[PDB]
Amino acid sequence: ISSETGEMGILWEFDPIINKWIRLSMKLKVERKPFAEGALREAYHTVSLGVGTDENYPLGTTKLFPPIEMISPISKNNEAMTQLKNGTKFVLKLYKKEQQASRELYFEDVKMQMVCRDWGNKFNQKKPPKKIEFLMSWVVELIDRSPSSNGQPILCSIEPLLVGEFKKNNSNYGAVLTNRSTPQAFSHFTYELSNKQMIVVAIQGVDDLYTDPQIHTPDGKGFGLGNLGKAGINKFITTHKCNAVCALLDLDV
Ligand SMILES: Nc1ncnc2c1ncn2[C@@H]1O[C@H](COP(=O)(O)OP(=O)(O)OP(=O)(O)O)[C@@H](O)[C@H]1O
Ligand SMILES: [Zn+2]
Numbered sequence: 001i002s003s004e005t006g007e008m009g010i011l012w013e014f015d016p017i018i019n020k021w022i023r024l025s026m027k028l029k030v031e032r033k034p035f036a037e038g039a040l041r042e043a044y045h046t047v048s049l050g051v052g053t054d055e056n057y058p059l060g061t062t063k064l065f066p067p068i069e070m071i072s073p074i075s076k077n078n079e080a081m082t083q084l085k086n087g088t089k090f091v092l093k094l095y096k097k098e099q100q101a102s103r104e105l106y107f108e109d110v111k112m113q114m115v116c117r118d119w120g121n122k123f124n125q126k127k128p129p130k131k132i133e134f135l136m137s138w139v140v141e142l143i144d145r146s147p148s149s150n151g152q153p154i155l156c157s158i159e160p161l162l163v164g165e166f167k168k169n170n171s172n173y174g175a176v177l178t179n180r181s182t183p184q185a186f187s188h189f190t191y192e193l194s195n196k197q198m199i200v201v202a203i204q205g206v207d208d209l210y211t212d213p214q215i216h217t218p219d220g221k222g223f224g225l226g227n228l229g230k231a232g233i234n235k236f237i238t239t240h241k242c243n244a245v246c247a248l249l250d251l252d253v
Contacts, residue, residue: 164206174235185245
């Protein structure tokens with residue numbers, strides 16, 4: 001953590017393999033205006049002023065989210081310390097004018113992204129023609145900012161900066177928006193290999209470095225408000241045509 005000058009944040013990293021959140025602190029400097037926006041969020045260029053521990057910001061005043069038993073007591077090891085080290089340029093995302101964004105939802109979005117990141121590794125283990133990867137994402141509590149009209153602290157999510165032409169390959173409701181095979185085959189892979197317990201769609205990013213994915217599950221629970229359940233899964237099916245990569249992976253037509 002550097003001096004000076006920016007704003008402090010509590011930084012949360014989820015680690016799927018121990019199934020725990022890792023709580024840290026960082027300092028960051030964010031541009032006043034967004035460089036981009038989509039249906040739900042605005043994105044801002046940001047630079048890291050370093051990552052440190054959470055010692056100064058005691059947890060549990062009580063009523064915790066995430067609850068204490070979901071939090072690692074040790075945080076010495078994490079991705080943030082290298083990927084957001086001092087001087088790193090990265091992206092910060094805020095929900096637009098939010099009504100429906102509870103605290104739990106931000107953590108849901110980050111966890112969802114980490115799950116998708118596991119699916120990417122699993123896809124890559126089949127050695128397809130093009131490997132894929134999902135970016136890290138983290139929750140940040142912007143503790144230096146005045147709480148909202150309702151007294152909630154300001155939350156956001158952050159992720160690495162993608163350099164290149166950002167493209168959306170499918171949506172979370174049936175749209176197939178480019179001719180590329182790998183993104184559609186990856187979505188189908190997740191459906192079949194999960195035994196239809198889930199699907200990853202809204203495959204989008206620069207080349208095969210993806211971010212902002214969306215998972216549908218049949219019960220429609222969790223995975224944020226973009227989880228459209230069976231309906232989302234079925235929409236994907238109606239517009240999906242298998243391609244050579246699906247064939248290479250031996251997926252059912
Ligand atoms: N990591 C990144 N690096 C560079 N640009 C990004 C990155 N993530 C998002 N963007 C840009 O910011 C825009 C909005 O971000 P994002 O897609 O995460 O939110 P959203 O648009 O609300 O989600 P959706 O469009 O799927 O509803 C994107 O459409 C893209 O132009
Ligand atoms: Zn297919």
